[PDB]
Amino acid sequence: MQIFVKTLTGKTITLEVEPSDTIENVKAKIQDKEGIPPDQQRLIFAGKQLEDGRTLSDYNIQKESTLHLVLRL
Amino acid sequence: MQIFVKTLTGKTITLEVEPSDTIENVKAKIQDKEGIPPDQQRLIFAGKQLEDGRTLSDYNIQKESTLHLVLRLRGG
Numbered sequence: 329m330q331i332f333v334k335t336l337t338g339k340t341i342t343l344e345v346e347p348s349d350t351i352e353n354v355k356a357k358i359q360d361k362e363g364i365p366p367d368q369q370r371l372i373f374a375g376k377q378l379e380d381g382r383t384l385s386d387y388n389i390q391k392e393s394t395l396h397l398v399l400r401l
Numbered sequence: 402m403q404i405f406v407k408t409l410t411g412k413t414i415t416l417e418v419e420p421s422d423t424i425e426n427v428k429a430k431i432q433d434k435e436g437i438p439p440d441q442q443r444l445i446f447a448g449k450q451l452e453d454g455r456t457l458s459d460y461n462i463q464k465e466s467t468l469h470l471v472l473r474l475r476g477g
Contacts, residue, residue: 343477344477346473349440357476
């Protein structure tokens, strides 16, 4: 399934993932496409900062959902 | 009953299953014979991607049927 990760600069990127993939896996994909180290990524969905060890289905992230990407200060 | 699972190279994998087994069980048996994690397996039959929660009989898969195995690349 496809999900979207949006920056606050209005850029949206598309990732191919399965519900079983971890947040850490998503961060790795983001590092590959955008060069941002995973330790600097905060992903946000449903008002929560997403923990690395959980899966997308653990957060009820589904096809075409959007996650927010912010950098850590 | 026996079913067959073909890979992209045309290699054949023979599995012993029952009609009441789920697609998720079939992927487990593929993992045990071939070492491929189930999260990386897509199974195709009669032009459909097969959903994990359904049984073989739900997809009218019978003895000596052949399924196609395609894999996902970690990392896209």
